[PDB]
Design a protein around this nucleic acid. Structure first.
Lengths: 86, 86
DNA sequence: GTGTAGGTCACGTGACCTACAC
DNA sequence: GTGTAGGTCACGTGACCTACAC
């Protein structure tokens, strides 16, 4: 009775499922130059990438928001500008 | 001669190195609610996360830039405003 | 509950790629 | 080059968690 077979084979479809869905992670990142590097570092590098996107982003959106208040002072500026012009 | 030993043990430090550096990937992402889920999906989910950060970001920074040209028209507006005031 | 089955891990190994020596 | 060693994978298994039935 294949009880090794369908098993030894089940684990080979699971494992493939990673080796394929693994490069999906790596190539899903720049700083690996589409080549080699441990499947221990595809974790490393990208694990930093989250620090980066949270890092770089959070600020950056807030800086859209300081562009907001920036345009608030602008508001005041407009509130002054004229009382009858355009 | 431990030739199994230092080996069977070498592979156990490597493997740990993943199980630890693996959650470093998972927890390095929201949408997993700090709990369980295949070490095949920690790849899945986060693999999308790159699509997202490139996605959401690229645009968003460009929209800082349409805020740029937005403030360009503003420039013209200023170029009109007054020729002697403040 | 006692089946029969799928997914999910972690272990113990057997290749192969290096590259340091000497 | 022929050593002796480390890292890196992928395979073949042996547990355990379920949860569908019946």
């Amino acid at each position: 009775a294949d009880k090794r077979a369908h098993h030894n084979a089940l684990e080979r479809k699971r494992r493939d499922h990673i080796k394929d869905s693994f490069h999906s992670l790596r190539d899903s990142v720049p700083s690996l130059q589409g080549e080699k590097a441990s499947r221990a570092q595809i974790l490393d590098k990208a694990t930093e990438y989250i620090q980066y996107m949270r890092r770089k982003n959070h600020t950056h959106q807030q800086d859209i928001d300081d562009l907001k208040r920036q345009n608030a002072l602008l508001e005041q500026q407009v509130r002054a500008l004229e009382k009858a012009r355009s």
